[PDB]
Amino acid sequence: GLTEEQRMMIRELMDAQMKTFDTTFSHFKNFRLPGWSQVRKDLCSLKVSLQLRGEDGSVWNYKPPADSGGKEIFSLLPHMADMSTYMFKGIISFAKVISYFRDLPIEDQISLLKGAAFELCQLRFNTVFNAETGTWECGRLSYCLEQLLLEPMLKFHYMLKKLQLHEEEYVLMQAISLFSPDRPGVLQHRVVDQLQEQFAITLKSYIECNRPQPAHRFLFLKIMAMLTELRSINAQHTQRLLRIQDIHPFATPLMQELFGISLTERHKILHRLLQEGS
Amino acid sequence: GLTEEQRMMIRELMDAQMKTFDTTFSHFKNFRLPGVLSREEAAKWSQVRKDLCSLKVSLQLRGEDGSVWNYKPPADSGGKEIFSLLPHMADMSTYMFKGIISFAKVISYFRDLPIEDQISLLKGAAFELCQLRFNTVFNAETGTWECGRLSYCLEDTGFQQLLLEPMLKFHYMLKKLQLHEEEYVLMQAISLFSPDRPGVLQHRVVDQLQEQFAITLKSYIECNRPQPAHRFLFLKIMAMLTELRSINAQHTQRLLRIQDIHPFATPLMQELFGISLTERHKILHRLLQE
Ligand SMILES: CCC[C@H](C)Oc1ccc(C(C)(C)C)cc1NC(=O)c1nnn(-c2cc(C)ccc2OC)c1C
Ligand SMILES: CCC[C@H](C)Oc1ccc(C(C)(C)C)cc1NC(=O)c1nnn(-c2cc(C)ccc2OC)c1C
Known part of the structure; x- marks a missing residue:
């Protein structure tokens, strides 16, 4: 069986996950809505339609335009920036209540969260991903995808969902990342x-x-291989995000901080959130 | 053929329609949309739920980029969700009525009547002329009113069941006649x-x-x-116009019942509903004056 300290370690990580991951997305509010070639091809694979289910029973549904070559390919990027920012804020809180992370120097806390923000975000997204319908079910919000498995981040979500991980295994992947x-x-x-x-x-x-x-069998080594793959996907998509932000600005102030290539000065928002409680 | 007096009478109506009917709904802007995410009063509330459930549509909004926003209405759960589209339809009705007001203003026959009869005629005919214009953009195959970038599609709340609703039976029967523009505009003048x-x-x-x-x-x-x-098309048209007046009284009473327990009417609509003739209709009076 597990040692006592391993039992305690899992218990602390699970408690952290429950306290900082709003799986109903009920506090995701005030987001924006819709009014180089390899990026355009990759953005086509990840094309999603947006569904918003109101509490009264109504449903707003957004179908994206077709690729006409103009700025239409970025109609959902402002919204996804608001969703990514909300998701990252839960990641910051997740790290803050961990005893091992809370004792590190503030700049290493900034550096670790900066390097793993996208990775822990994709890991939490995978737990709400429906591999049958190709939909991320984010409470009242749904994002439904329109050979497409060629895209690395898409392939990652299908491969990881196929392992059927437990909550404990997801949260341990988050800590390793x-x-x-x-x-x-x-x-x-x-x-x-x-x-x-x-x-x-x-x-x-x-x-x-x-x-x-x-x-x-070999599930542990599969997970560690998936974590190494996710770190690679992080580098590709972070670099891809900088090109798009250069062409069409969409990143929230907190996201710009992550994208910047002293430490507490260049990350004033993340620094403040690390000092705030819960 | 037609006499010249009848010819110019049609020319004036067609001219009126051309100048005041925004058939593409291009200038319908800044409308409201559904948001994102006692004793005898129970009888008044129960009656309104029956009024609102007969007529249910989904709202489709097409953007310039080619995107499609689509609104699907909630089901009657007992709360205010049954009024989710009334703000939008209040703005649509108001926009249409102002076009109807402008339509009557440029007809010389209507201009020469006393201002209080002009108020009384537009008050009694506003709903009818609105439905008549709505029918010209009604697609009977898809059950959809196509208002430019806005679309309102009937929901299968069977069809013989929907045909029971007189306002829907009106739009299907009138569309089946396949009337000309001149015949619609003459229906508008008769009404x-x-x-x-x-x-x-x-x-x-x-x-x-x-x-x-x-x-x-x-x-x-x-x-x-x-x-x-x-041989009987004219009599069919007049029969349609007669039924439209009953649909007018029926749905005008529904609006007053809804406004009683859940206000939604714009100021110009409040004048039309009854909420000196000139002093009770100051907005409509002003629009006829300019
Ligand atoms: C809610 C589920 C979204 C799914 C899983 O995925 C998408 C699906 C479609 C689309 C478009 C708009 C192209 C249709 C986008 C995305 N996904 C992103 O927009 C995105 N996902 N993670 N992050 C990101 C996050 C941090 C903290 C740091 C850096 C990050 O980017 C490097 C971002 C910006
Ligand atoms: C544009 C397509 C809408 C179709 C044709 O129709 C509806 C379909 C559905 C619904 C709900 C919201 C119940 C789902 C409503 C309505 N239609 C009305 O809301 C309405 N149509 N005409 N008028 C009205 C207008 C005047 C000038 C004067 C009086 C009037 O009402 C007496 C009004 C207020």
Whole structure:
């Protein structure tokens, strides 16, 4: 079985997830709505329609335009920036209530969240992804996709959903991604690296104590391979986001902070959120 | 053929329609849309839910980029969700009525009547002329009123069930007649010049005027359509106009009942509903004056 400290480690991560992940998206408000070639082709694969279900029973449905070559390909990017910002704020709170993360220097806290923001966001998105309908079910909001598995982020969501992970395995993936000692700007490398290794050992122990079926053979090494793949997808899409923001500005002030290539000065919003409570 | 007096009478109506009917709804802007995300009073509330459930549509809004916003209405759950579209339809009705006001203003026959009879005629005919213009953009195949970039599609709340609703039976039957523009605009004049509206004083004048429009329409049909096949088209049109007046009274009473428990009417609509004739209709009076 799991050791006591591993039991406590999982318990703290799960408690953090429950306290900082609003799976109903009920507090997502005041978002915007609709009024290089490799990017355009990739943006075509991820084309989604937006459905908003009101409490009264009504449904607003947005179908995106077709690719005509103009600025029509970015009609949903302002909205997704507001959704990404809301999602990241939950990620910040998730990290803040973790004991191992809260004790790191403030700049390493900034650097870790900066390097893992997209990765923990995609991990939480996967838990609301419906692989049958191709829809991310975000409470009252739904995002339904329109060979398309060629796109890496799309392929990632299908591959990860196929593993049928438990909540504990998702939250341990989040901790492994969060405590990456090789993020730019990290100073406490050995401290963060020692923390990451214990999360990975905890995940391996959890899988062996709860997943005996042959369908879950090599599941731990599959998860670690998925985490390395997600870090690659992070680099591609962050770089892709900078090109788009250059051409058509869409990023919220908090997102611009993530995209900037002193530490607390360049990240005033993230710095304030790390100092605020919950 | 038609006499020249009937010819110029049609020319004036067609000219009126061309200048005041925004058929593409291009200048319908800044409208409201549904938001994103006792004892005898129970009888008044129960009655309104029956009024609002017979007529249910989804709203479609097409953007210039090619995108499509679509609104699907909620189901009757007992709350205010049954009024989710009344703000929009208040803005649409107001926009249409102002076009109807302008339509009557440029007809010389209507301009020469006393201002209080003009108020009384537009008050009694506003709904009817609005439905008549709505029918010209009504698609009977898809059950959709196509108002430029806005579309209102009937929901299958069967069809023989929907045909029971007189306002929907009106739009399907009138569309099936496949009327010309001239016949629609003559229906509008016959409806506008109804001598039996409340508050009209020059009834004999308005009746003579209505009869000349009706005779003009009857003559138009005899001279412009194959004789045997359209032998009763004029009588069908007049029968449609007679039913439209009953639909007018029926739906005007529904609006007053809804306004009682859930106000939604714009100021110009409040004047039309009854919420000196000139002092009770200051907005409509001002629009007729300019
Ligand atoms: C709600 C579910 C969205 C699905 C999972 O996905 C999309 C599907 C469609 C589309 C478009 C608009 C192209 C149709 C976009 C996206 N997804 C993004 O817009 C996006 N997802 N994560 N992040 C991001 C987040 C951080 C913290 C930091 C950096 C980040 O980007 C590097 C962003 C900006
Ligand atoms: C543009 C397509 C709408 C179709 C044709 O129709 C409806 C379909 C659905 C609905 C609801 C909201 C119930 C789903 C309403 C309505 N229609 C009205 O809301 C309405 N149509 N004409 N008028 C009206 C106008 C005047 C000048 C004077 C008086 C009038 O009402 C007595 C009004 C207020």
